[PDB]
């Protein structure tokens, strides 16, 4: 599930993973 873009950013986002970058780590750092 994508989940407003990222409810997990590689949740799957069926891409499989890395659906949105860079907040694939955000909560690593900044939210983008």
CSV table of N, CA, C and O in Angstrom, one decimal:
chain,number,residue,atom,x,y,z
A,1,UNK,N,0.8,-1.2,0.0
A,1,UNK,CA,0.0,0.0,0.0
A,1,UNK,C,0.8,1.2,0.0
A,1,UNK,O,1.6,1.5,0.9
A,2,UNK,N,0.5,2.1,-1.0
A,2,UNK,CA,1.2,3.4,-1.0
A,2,UNK,C,1.1,4.3,0.1
A,2,UNK,O,2.1,4.7,0.7
A,3,UNK,N,-0.2,4.6,0.6
A,3,UNK,CA,-0.6,5.2,1.8
A,3,UNK,C,-0.2,6.6,2.1
A,3,UNK,O,0.4,7.1,3.1
A,4,UNK,N,-0.7,7.4,1.2
A,4,UNK,CA,-0.7,8.9,1.0
A,4,UNK,C,0.7,9.2,0.5
A,4,UNK,O,1.4,9.9,1.3
A,5,UNK,N,1.1,8.5,-0.6
A,5,UNK,CA,2.4,8.4,-0.9
A,5,UNK,C,3.3,7.5,-0.3
A,5,UNK,O,4.0,6.7,-0.9
A,6,UNK,N,3.4,7.5,1.1
A,6,UNK,CA,4.3,6.7,1.9
A,6,UNK,C,3.7,6.5,3.2
A,6,UNK,O,3.8,7.3,4.2
A,7,UNK,N,3.1,5.3,3.4
A,7,UNK,CA,2.7,4.8,4.7
A,7,UNK,C,3.5,3.6,5.0
A,7,UNK,O,3.8,3.2,6.2
A,8,UNK,N,4.2,3.2,4.0
A,8,UNK,CA,5.6,2.8,4.2
A,8,UNK,C,6.1,3.2,2.8
A,8,UNK,O,5.5,2.8,1.8
A,9,UNK,N,7.2,3.8,2.6
A,9,UNK,CA,7.7,4.2,1.4
A,9,UNK,C,8.2,3.2,0.4
A,9,UNK,O,8.5,3.5,-0.8
A,10,UNK,N,8.4,2.0,0.9
A,10,UNK,CA,8.7,0.8,0.1
A,10,UNK,C,7.8,-0.3,0.6
A,10,UNK,O,8.2,-1.4,0.9
A,11,UNK,N,6.5,0.0,0.9
A,11,UNK,CA,5.7,-0.7,1.7
A,11,UNK,C,5.2,-2.2,1.6
A,11,UNK,O,5.2,-2.9,2.5
A,12,UNK,N,4.8,-2.7,0.4
A,12,UNK,CA,5.2,-2.3,-0.9
A,12,UNK,C,4.5,-1.1,-1.4
A,12,UNK,O,3.4,-0.7,-1.0
A,13,UNK,N,5.2,-0.4,-2.3
A,13,UNK,CA,4.5,0.6,-3.1
A,13,UNK,C,4.4,0.1,-4.5
A,13,UNK,O,4.1,0.8,-5.5
A,14,UNK,N,4.7,-1.2,-4.6
A,14,UNK,CA,4.4,-2.1,-5.7
A,14,UNK,C,5.3,-1.9,-6.9
A,14,UNK,O,5.3,-2.5,-8.0
A,15,UNK,N,6.2,-1.0,-6.7
A,15,UNK,CA,7.3,-0.7,-7.6
A,15,UNK,C,8.4,-1.7,-7.6
A,15,UNK,O,8.9,-2.0,-8.6
A,16,UNK,N,8.8,-2.3,-6.4
A,16,UNK,CA,8.2,-2.7,-5.2
A,16,UNK,C,8.4,-1.7,-4.1
A,16,UNK,O,7.6,-1.5,-3.3
A,17,UNK,N,9.6,-1.2,-4.1
A,17,UNK,CA,10.2,-0.3,-3.1
A,17,UNK,C,11.0,0.7,-3.6
A,17,UNK,O,11.5,0.8,-4.8
A,18,UNK,N,11.2,1.8,-2.8
A,18,UNK,CA,11.4,3.1,-3.4
A,18,UNK,C,10.3,3.7,-4.2
A,18,UNK,O,10.4,4.1,-5.3
A,19,UNK,N,9.1,3.8,-3.6
A,19,UNK,CA,8.0,4.4,-4.2
A,19,UNK,C,8.1,5.9,-4.2
A,19,UNK,O,7.9,6.5,-5.3
A,20,UNK,N,8.5,6.5,-3.1
A,20,UNK,CA,8.9,7.9,-3.2
A,20,UNK,C,10.2,8.2,-2.5
A,20,UNK,O,10.4,7.8,-1.4
A,21,UNK,N,11.0,9.1,-3.1
A,21,UNK,CA,12.4,9.3,-2.7
A,21,UNK,C,12.4,10.8,-2.5
A,21,UNK,O,11.8,11.4,-3.4
A,22,UNK,N,13.0,11.4,-1.5
A,22,UNK,CA,14.0,10.8,-0.6
A,22,UNK,C,13.4,10.3,0.7
A,22,UNK,O,14.1,9.6,1.5
A,23,UNK,N,12.1,10.7,1.0
A,23,UNK,CA,11.6,10.2,2.2
A,23,UNK,C,11.4,8.8,2.4
A,23,UNK,O,10.8,8.3,3.4
A,24,UNK,N,12.0,8.0,1.5
A,24,UNK,CA,12.3,6.6,1.7
A,24,UNK,C,13.4,6.4,2.8
A,24,UNK,O,13.4,5.5,3.5
A,25,UNK,N,14.3,7.4,2.9
A,25,UNK,CA,14.5,7.8,4.3
A,25,UNK,C,14.1,9.2,4.5
A,25,UNK,O,14.9,10.2,4.4
A,26,UNK,N,12.9,9.4,5.2
A,26,UNK,CA,12.5,10.6,5.9
A,26,UNK,C,11.8,9.9,7.1
A,26,UNK,O,11.3,8.9,6.9
A,27,UNK,N,12.1,10.6,8.2
A,27,UNK,CA,12.3,10.0,9.5
A,27,UNK,C,13.6,9.3,9.6
A,27,UNK,O,14.1,8.9,10.7
A,28,UNK,N,14.3,9.2,8.5
A,28,UNK,CA,15.7,9.3,8.5
A,28,UNK,C,16.3,10.7,8.7
A,28,UNK,O,17.0,11.0,9.6
A,29,UNK,N,15.8,11.6,7.7
A,29,UNK,CA,15.8,13.0,7.8
A,29,UNK,C,14.6,13.6,7.2
A,29,UNK,O,13.5,13.1,7.5
A,30,UNK,N,14.8,14.7,6.4
A,30,UNK,CA,13.8,15.5,6.0
A,30,UNK,C,12.7,15.0,5.1
A,30,UNK,O,13.1,14.2,4.2
A,31,UNK,N,11.5,15.3,5.2
A,31,UNK,CA,10.4,14.8,4.6
A,31,UNK,C,10.0,14.9,3.2
A,31,UNK,O,8.9,15.2,2.7
A,32,UNK,N,11.0,14.7,2.2
A,32,UNK,CA,10.8,14.9,0.8
A,32,UNK,C,11.4,13.7,0.1
A,32,UNK,O,10.6,12.8,-0.1
